[PDB]
Amino acid sequence: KTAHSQGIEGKAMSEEWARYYPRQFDSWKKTKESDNITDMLKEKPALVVAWAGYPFSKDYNAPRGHYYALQDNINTLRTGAPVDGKTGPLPSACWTCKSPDVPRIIEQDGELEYFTGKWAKYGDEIVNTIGCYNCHDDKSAELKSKVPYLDRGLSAAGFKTFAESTHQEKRSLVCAQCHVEYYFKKTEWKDDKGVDKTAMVVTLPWSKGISTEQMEAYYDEINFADWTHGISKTPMLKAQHPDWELYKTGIHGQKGVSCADCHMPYTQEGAVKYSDHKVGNPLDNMDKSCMNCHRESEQKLKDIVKQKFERKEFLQDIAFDNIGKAHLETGKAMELGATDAELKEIRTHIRHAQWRADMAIAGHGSFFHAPEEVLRLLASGNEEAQKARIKLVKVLAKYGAIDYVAPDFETKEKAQKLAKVDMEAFIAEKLKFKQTLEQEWKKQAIAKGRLNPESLKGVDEKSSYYDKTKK
Amino acid sequence: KTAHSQGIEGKAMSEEWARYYPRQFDSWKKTKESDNITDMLKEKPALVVAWAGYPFSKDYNAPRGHYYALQDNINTLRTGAPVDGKTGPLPSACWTCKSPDVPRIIEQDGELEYFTGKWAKYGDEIVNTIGCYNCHDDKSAELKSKVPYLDRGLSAAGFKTFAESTHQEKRSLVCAQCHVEYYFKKTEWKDDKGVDKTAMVVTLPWSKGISTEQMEAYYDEINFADWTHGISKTPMLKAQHPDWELYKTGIHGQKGVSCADCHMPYTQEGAVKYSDHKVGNPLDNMDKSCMNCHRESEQKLKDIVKQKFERKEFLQDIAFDNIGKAHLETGKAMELGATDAELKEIRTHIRHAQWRADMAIAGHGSFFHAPEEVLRLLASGNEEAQKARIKLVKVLAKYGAIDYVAPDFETKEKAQKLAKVDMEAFIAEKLKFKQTLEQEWKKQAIAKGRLNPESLKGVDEKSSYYDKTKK
Ligand code: HEC
Ligand code: HEC
Ligand code: HEC
Ligand code: HEC
Ligand code: HEC
Ligand code: HEC
Ligand code: HEC
Ligand code: HEC
Ligand code: HEC
Ligand code: HEC
Ligand SMILES: [Ca+2]
Ligand SMILES: [Ca+2]
Ligand SMILES: [Y+2]
Ligand SMILES: [Y+2]
Ligand SMILES: [Y+2]
Ligand SMILES: [Y+2]
Ligand SMILES: [Y+2]
């Protein structure tokens, strides 16, 4: 048994676990070191065109330390600027994979209630970032999935549930609670008081399997669309960090190497074994993350990973360039009078091209986790995009614009203009929200004892639209 | 020293080495077991369209045992039906990587003389198949490259020559004498008698490096073309088994694992070590070919290789389908009156698309030797093909055929009709050659003592156009 077999008071606050596990708490806190904000829309402006008419065309950055998960959720322009708990563009489900306060609230008010309402609804309740409670039982300290949608997805795909899995499988599944592709399913329900409500439930599109093509069939079967493209009016699908799904198909995943083996390597000290809880780049600690299975220079192995990244970039730039052009060319055809009937097949091609290309790049480590599937996906997506473009030349010709040249979108500025994103406006509105409602959320959370100010140190010095210098 | 330190009389005939190395001779002879003839034009008819106007549109099969190299060189419809030593479509250079009689002749008449004349020129001299003398010194039995063009290529690419390489590197370089991409360079020269002659010299296009793109630049710089496409009139480049080049970039090649490690695995018997000389499929002998470095079931490793093959096939079919359509669409535009100026960019795209796609599939083991580069190449080639097709829609439109649909080529029969290949005629002509001149070559070679009839057992029972049943 543990030294807290009856549970931990204030379990959602990771600092409450420090008295029992100071070592893991210390390394866990170190993800604060990974504070870099890489603006992906600035690096890859083609993505802005791909996501026109969707929040990702406003703000999308690369992943950084777990220490910043909650704050980045708050800072991203995607969550907008609510003025109260009933406003703002996004739903409560956006907190789900950002805080240990999520299982706390679910276990208190029920899953459906948690998934009901606006993101702003829990602003002063969900205030702790990725913590001990998101992965451990507060009585046995054993690994556990705290979100019901994971087992639901696992079963649907023919996988064993978390409780039925081996220890090694759990070392990856705890990560899969969040590092997977998902979509919000509108769900009607009635509470204990008989009131009719509507929830937006996190759902893993795994009922037909976890391959990109199986998920695609899944979405097409239910005629689902995350949004209607702002330029091409295509019924679009958004892929979001399908880290585990692509990992499972890669060679390491097939060989049984878990997420933890590389991202949370062991350190043996006598008869005691410790897991590095500073979840980050395995390449910064290869001696413990890689060289325990591979025998050769760290530099050579690093060069090999670099090679994979370059190959992925090569195909990614081609795919998204043609996807961007297809969107713009479809928009031009619409402007000339092309009918939905004339553009139906074209739009289906675009939908599939981007779904496959996005699924390939949305998981930032996929180029390494499953190198070959990533390249194949990008090649498949590009082919769908070009099939659309070949058909588009004919539609453009019918309307007298066969020589139309889709405008360029080589910079974030030019791309956002094409996507009609008024950044200045969104940023100004965001800052006002942060200076008012956000500070009230934090003040109230601290007053109620849900938030410890110590956890806020250097947590809000950077975003894609401001940098106080160094976190 | 060896037991034949002064050399071996009749060294070109591998049977002459059996008295010294009966074990290696026995396994070497066993490649006779790999007698399967897989007609690649039947399996992948798109290749016929790709090679229209070139010999490969007539006959192209997958590789089989070394035991059949010489006979397949004779049987392929590509070498045609010469009636004497001055006729036939191909040059003497076609014998180069098929027989130990090649170094014998080169060392006797000089490199330039060997490379001068028709293939039929040496019909009764080059009669032994891949033998001991192609890879070993007949005095020390040490590994050696017997062809000057390899070191020439190695140096040109910044690599060390064969003699300057390590033993492990030599275990792969001996294979590189033949398993590489090449082209025939027309070379003017004058013999000892002052006579002016023209030779077609095997040349490795490695002066700019060994990557597909570097070789492409190499060919473009000298405005080289293997042939003018029979349908699109595009200046084409033919890739031929760039096995070593792609292998060198793969992870195994980067890690120092030689061709021999998998294809000629060791067998330890006490203090003596033997190399399996039955060069074939490593998957048929995984315990010795793979499991000496990898630790897991043979089936799982086999399934993984199968997965790579399927991914490669997926992208290959897409690439060659668009390449085929581009060729046909260009041919249609020509028929309508399109000028060379209007088709110049299109043709450059096609040339590059096929060069990259062919380089990816010409090496039959590349899907495994360098999985990721193969997928990237096929994706790159496909993109070039689609760029050509998008431009072709516009040219077709200018000439009133925007709705043109390139004919299908899903069967070898239909593809060869589009490529205007009269198979019946070529086969009939070939059989007459085999029944007359070929039998004379073999009779004379046997009379002169250059050929041992024992080596002909079951060697000519199959081809792509006949099957006496079982070799
Ligand atoms: C949900 C509760 C999560 C769980 C459980 C795990 N991760 Fe996570 N991870 C999550 C978020 C929301 C983020 C983004 C953080 C931000 O503010 O940008 C991340 C990020 C990572 C990263 C990147 C770290 C970096 O320095 O860039 C990695 C490598 C990562 N996460 C890995 C990972 C693994 C291996 C997990 C299981 C052991 C794991 N995460 C769980 C959300 C969640
Ligand atoms: C779990 C199933 C998640 C849900 C539901 C949402 N997010 Fe998420 N988010 C999750 C992970 C594992 C990661 C890291 C890996 C990655 O590729 O991003 C993230 C990261 C973010 C970030 C930082 C990166 C960025 O996009 O700028 C933000 C700002 C973020 N997530 C916001 C966010 C919102 C608004 C959501 C609702 C639509 C949302 N996430 C849901 C996991 C999950
Ligand atoms: C999920 C993303 C995790 C978070 C957040 C935290 N821990 Fe963790 N922990 C996780 C894994 C995958 C593992 C390895 C499991 C295994 O048996 O291999 C661990 C392990 C521990 C342990 C056991 C000893 C060790 O391996 O170091 C302890 C005591 C532990 N974790 C404590 C702990 C605390 C206090 C955390 C918050 C500060 C915490 N963990 C977060 C995954 C995750
Ligand atoms: C042991 C548990 C492992 C750890 C930790 C890492 N790798 Fe690994 N790797 C492992 C296996 C069993 C395999 C399958 C092939 C084999 O050797 O049997 C691999 C394979 C790779 C590869 C090649 C596959 C590819 O993607 O092309 C690479 C380049 C590789 N591994 C790199 C690598 C790095 C950089 C790691 C640390 C971050 C790492 N591996 C950890 C087993 C294990
Ligand atoms: C070792 C063999 C690994 C396994 C198993 C998993 N990951 Fe990984 N991951 C690894 C590397 C070498 C990299 C690339 C690092 C680089 O900078 O080149 C990654 C990357 C990620 C990322 C991207 C983080 C970022 O870009 O900021 C994430 C989010 C990530 N990995 C998550 C993750 C999860 C959840 C895994 C299991 C499903 C997983 N990784 C396994 C190495 C290894
Ligand atoms: C030229 C003199 C060669 C040398 C030296 C090596 N190979 Fe070869 N190989 C060559 C030819 C002309 C052929 C085609 C044979 C035919 O009639 O189709 C081949 C074929 C192979 C194969 C395929 C065998 C099968 O059963 O399908 C392999 C796997 C192969 N060769 C490998 C190989 C290796 C590893 C070498 C060096 C040790 C090697 N070959 C040398 C011509 C020549
Ligand atoms: C060495 C540099 C070569 C030259 C020059 C030529 N060939 Fe070849 N050939 C070589 C190898 C290594 C292989 C096996 C690997 C492969 O992918 O094919 C071959 C195989 C053949 C075959 C059998 C397969 C087929 O194409 O049906 C034939 C019939 C053949 N080679 C014929 C041939 C001719 C006519 C050549 C002159 C143009 C020629 N080869 C040159 C290596 C080399
Ligand atoms: C080239 C394609 C080869 C042909 C044809 C033959 N041999 Fe070979 N042989 C080759 C290699 C790559 C190796 C291994 C070299 C090493 O040191 O690792 C060998 C080795 C031998 C040896 C040494 C002992 C052994 O490893 O078995 C002998 C005595 C030998 N080869 C003899 C031999 C004979 C008699 C051949 C013709 C019948 C023959 N080899 C062909 C490559 C090639
Ligand atoms: C030892 C000399 C090896 C032999 C013989 C074979 N492989 Fe190998 N393999 C080896 C290394 C050092 C690596 C690099 C990665 C690592 O584990 O350190 C590999 C890698 C692979 C891979 C993964 C890479 C990829 O292509 O995705 C696979 C799938 C693999 N090896 C398969 C394999 C098979 C089937 C072999 C026999 C025919 C084989 N390898 C031999 C080292 C060695
Ligand atoms: C092990 C790690 C290998 C190394 C090193 C090399 N080859 Fe290989 N080769 C290997 C496999 C697993 C395969 C595929 C077998 C299958 O049927 O799936 C191949 C295949 C080839 C081929 C194709 C033969 C055919 O299709 O008939 C050739 C011609 C070949 N390999 C040649 C070859 C050469 C010359 C190498 C060094 C440059 C080489 N291989 C290395 C495994 C391994
Ligand atoms: Ca989604
Ligand atoms: Ca060539
Ligand atoms: Y406490
Ligand atoms: Y990062
Ligand atoms: Y690979
Ligand atoms: Y003798
Ligand atoms: Y074969």
From Swiss-Prot, chains A, B:
Q: Does the keyword Signal apply?
A: yes
Q: Which CDD domains match?
A: NrfA-like
Q: Provide the reaction this enzyme catalyses.
A: 6 Fe(III)-[cytochrome c] + NH4(+) + 2 H2O = 6 Fe(II)-[cytochrome c] + nitrite + 8 H(+)
Q: Which residues bind heme c 5?
A: H252, C290, C293, H294
Cross-referenced InterPro entries, in alphabetical order? Cyt_c552 (IPR003321), Cyt_c_NO2Rdtase_formate-dep (IPR017570), Multihaem_cyt_sf (IPR036280)
User: Which residues of this UniProt protein bind heme c 3?
Assistant: H66, C175, C178, H179
Subcellular location(s) of the protein: Periplasm
Which EC number(s) are documented for this chain? 1.7.2.2
**Biological-process GO terms, alphabetical:** anaerobic electron transport chain; anaerobic respiration; nitrate assimilation
Q: What is its main location?
A: periplasm
State whether keyword Zinc-finger applies. Answer: no
Q: Could you say which residues bind substrate here?
A: Y182, H241
Chain sites annotated for binding Ca(2+): E181, Y182, K238, Q240
For this UniProt record, the keywords arranged alphabetically read as follows: Calcium, Electron transport, Heme, Iron, Metal-binding, Oxidoreductase, Periplasm, Signal, Transport
Gene Ontology cellular component list: outer membrane-bounded periplasmic space
Residues that coordinate or bind heme c 4: C259, C262, H263, H369
**What top-level class of enzyme does the UniProt entry assign?**
oxidoreductase
| Domain of life (superkingdom) | Bacteria
**Binding locations of heme c 1:** C94, C97, K98
Q: Read off the Pfam families from this record.
A: Cytochrom_C552 (PF02335)
Gene Ontology MF terms: calcium ion binding; heme binding; nitrite reductase (cytochrome, ammonia-forming) activity
Q: Oligomeric state and partners? A: Homodimer. Interacts with NrfH. May form a heterotetramer with NrfH.
Give the family, as the similarity comment puts it.
Belongs to the cytochrome c-552 family.
Q: What does this protein do?
A: Catalyzes the reduction of nitrite to ammonia, consuming six electrons in the process. Has very low activity toward hydroxylamine, and even lower activity toward sulfite. Sulfite reductase activity is maximal at neutral pH.
Protein name, per record: Cytochrome c-552
Species of the source? Wolinella succinogenes (strain ATCC 29543 / DSM 1740 / CCUG 13145 / JCM 31913 / LMG 7466 / NCTC 11488 / FDC 602W) (Vibrio succinogenes)
